Amino acid sequence: MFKPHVTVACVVHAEGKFLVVEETINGKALWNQPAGHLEADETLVEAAARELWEETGISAQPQHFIRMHQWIAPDKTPFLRFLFAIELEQICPTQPHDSDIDCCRWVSAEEILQASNLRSPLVAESIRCYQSGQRYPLEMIGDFNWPFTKGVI
């Protein structure tokens, strides 16, 4: 039966700057939000928090849900891409724990919106959606009667 590739992404914002990971996709250096694929026995925010750590070394929970984007990539892969928002009081050190990621760069909104080296068109959309200022609670895409442990206090 049909099953879409489910992904999560984070808009990490601090001091008027957005966090962006660089990645070499067959021969070209492209930018994306700290993002990746959802795994088995995993909550969507747990996926987002994990991917954030794997790609950037930053350890922080998602705060608000922004939006989900349903789209097909040019390789014909169908995605359900869940975007989250993270505000940090200040810019912090980054270090990828993923050989896929070359470096991280704290970059302005205009620098992304006008960039020509984005992983996908959703990189720019994620900024447009964040700039609107519309944010939603994490519960509205939350787990239900979840069997595994999740967090503490």
Question: Is residue 67 within 8 Å of 153, Cβ to Cβ?
Answer: no
* Rounded alpha-carbon distances, angstroms, from residue 79 to 48, 71, 74, 82: 15, 5, 11, 9
What's the topology of domain 1-153?
Answer: Nucleoside Triphosphate Pyrophosphohydrolase (3.90.79)
Phi, psi values for residue 15, rounded to 5°: 50, 40
Residues in the chain: 153
Token representation of residue 137: 């609670």
Question: Is residue 135 within 8 Å of 65, Cβ to Cβ?
Answer: yes
Token representation of residue 45: 């925010």
Q: DSSP assignment of 50-95, as one string?
A: HHHHHHH-------EEEEEEEEE-TT--EEEEEEEEEE-SS-----
Question: CA quadruple 79, 138, 67, 12: dihedral positive or negative?
Answer: negative
Question: Is residue 14 within 8 Å of 92, Cβ to Cβ?
Answer: yes
* Cα–Cα distance for residue pair 6/63, rounded to 1 Å: 20
Strands 101-107 and 28-32: unpaired
Q: In the chain, where are the structural domains located?
A: 1-153
Please indicate the experimental technique that yielded this structure. Answer: X-ray
Strands 35-37 and 17-25: unpaired
Reported structure resolution in angstroms: 2.7
Q: How many CA atoms lie within 13 A of 52 on its CB side?
A: 23
